[PDB]
Design a protein around this ligand. Structure first.
Ligand SMILES: [Zn+2]
Ligand SMILES: [Zn+2]
Lengths: 54, 163, 156
């Protein structure tokens, strides 16, 4: 049972979840988001790192 | 240019296991619910009686909408457990929402309908019912200012790491 | 809903070193989007089937292949498949190898093609499932929509 490293509740199916591009914590859809740069680059950032940089 | 839009992939399945109503003597039941989806399994605690209330939420981050959520209600035994009943909910029938719902009462069936070794429904209705909610959530949106901040911050770090 | 579009994302073949690739495929039709998980190597195999409810046929299926990075994931290639071109069949197929292009072409903030071929290819099966019948009322609606794609409901 891999589980979101933020909420510790959501369980990931194999290969699901995203790693935070900053802290590398694997997170579920409730716990971080995506920043898309032009049409060819995307990064992922968890809500804890978001909070820190606010 | 730079977007914080989360887009529209439905990956987070939320399931609310509410309660059940069994036909028969209450001392006969000490039951739990198991949920299975995309080879992930979760379970409530066991609750006694003919009207158990679990009120437990479960979340699964998945990517295969082509399957279903198997729900099983099990009567706990000290040596073996015995299935009270089951339903199978195709993931394509599950609403997309941001809110918890009231659930619906579903009749529990006794047996899976199997085709080609995979479950595709259930059969042989019992007189028991379960109250269950399920919904998919959409990904979060990051506001544009905050997205631009993160893109620049981590572009600079990427540029530094590459050097 | 005129038809259910089935899309089988089978595998891909990348030019260059195995260890450079850890890739996933995303699909978009109208505002419905889907994704595979990431698989390592120069010839990853996803073998994942997707389905979309299609009501208009003048648009396309956008397919993107992304490569995971520590910070950024990078889009390694894309194709845009006009829906009107997809085979009409209930039968799954072996897929066709399609060369991945470097970027989308836009008309009015919206994809209308791709350009700049890469040396990477994707194996995709796509087909429209046959509807069971088309009620007289809906046939009139589809006849109008198809007749501006130089198309018309099969008389049978
Ligand atoms: Zn989470
Ligand atoms: Zn983080």
């Amino acid at each position: 049972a891999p589980t979101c490293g933020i909420c510790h509740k959501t369980k990931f199916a194999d290969g699901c979840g995203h790693n935070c591009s900053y802290c590398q914590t694997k997170f579920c859809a409730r716990c971080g988001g995506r920043v898309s740069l032009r049409s060819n680059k995307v990064m992922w950032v968890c809500n804890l790192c978001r909070k820190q940089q606010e | 240019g730079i977007s914080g839009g989360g887009g529209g992939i439905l990956s987070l399945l939320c399931v609310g296991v509410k309660k059940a109503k069994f036909d028969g003597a209450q001392e006969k039941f000490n039951t739990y619910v198991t949920l299975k989806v995309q080879n992930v399994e979760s379970t409530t605690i066991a609750v006694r009686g003919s009207q158990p209330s679990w009120e437990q939420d479960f979340m699964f981050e998945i990517n295969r909408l082509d399957l279903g959520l198997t729900v099983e209600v099990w009567n706990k035994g000290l040596i073996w457990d015995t299935m009270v009943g089951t339903v199978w909910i195709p993931l394509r029938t599950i609403r997309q929402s941001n809110e918890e719902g009231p659930g619906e009462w579903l009749t529990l069936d006794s047996q899976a309908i199997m085709a080609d070794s995979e479950i595709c429904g259930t059969k042989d209705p019992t007189f028991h019912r379960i109250l269950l909610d399920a919904h998919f959530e959409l990904p979060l949106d990051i506001p544009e200012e905050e997205a631009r901040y993160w893109a620049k911050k981590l572009e600079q770090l990427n540029a530094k790491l590459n050097s």
